[PDB]
Design brief:
With about 130 residues, the protein is mainly α. About 60% of the residues lie in helices and about 0% in strands. The PDB classes it as immune system.
Length: about 130
C-alpha cells in the first residue's frame, strides 16, 4: 500500500528527527531549562493527532532555539526537517482537537512522550 509506505517513511524520519532533537536537548541545553514545565497532550493514537505536535512546536521551537547553550544553524535545520515531515503527514481536515493533561512536563519528557506516541501511531499504519 504505497501511500501507507509513504506515511511510514515520513513517520520513521520524524522518529529519527525527534530522537536527534532529544539527544541535543540533553547534551546542549543549559541546566536552567531543567525547571521549565509546560502542558502537553494526552492520548495521541492516530495520524491526525500529530497536528497536536505541530501546534505545540509553533512556540516550543522558539523556546528550543533560545534555550541553547552558546549550534543554532544545526538546530534550525533539524526543526525545519521536523516541520516538513509533519506537513507531509498532515491530512486535509480543516480543524483538529487536542486534549491536555494538567500535569506539566519538561522538554525532555515532552520529547520522550512524543517519541512513544509516534511509535504507537506507527503500528496503526495498517
Amino acid at each position: 500500500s504505497s501511500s501507507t509506505k509513504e506515511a511510514q517513511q515520513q513517520l520513521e524520519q520524524l522518529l529519527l528527527d525527534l530522537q536527534l532533537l532529544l539527544n541535543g536537548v540533553k547534551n546542549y541545553e543549559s541546566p536552567r531549562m531543567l525547571t521549565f514545565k509546560f502542558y502537553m497532550p494526552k492520548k495521541a493514537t492516530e495520524l491526525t493527532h500529530l497536528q497536536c505536535l505541530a501546534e505545540e512546536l509553533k512556540l516550543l521551537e522558539e523556546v528550543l532555539y533560545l534555550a541553547q547553550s552558546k549550534h543554532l544553524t544545526d538546530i534550525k535545520e533539524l526543526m525545519s526537517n521536523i516541520n516538513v515531515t509533519l506537513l507531509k503527514l498532515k491530512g486535509s481536515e480543516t480543524s483538529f482537537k487536542c486534549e491536555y493533561d494538567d500535569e506539566t512536563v519538561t522538554i525532555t519528557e515532552f520529547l520522550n512522550k512524543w517519541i512513544t506516541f509516534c511509535q504507537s501511531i506507527f503500528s496503526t499504519l495498517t
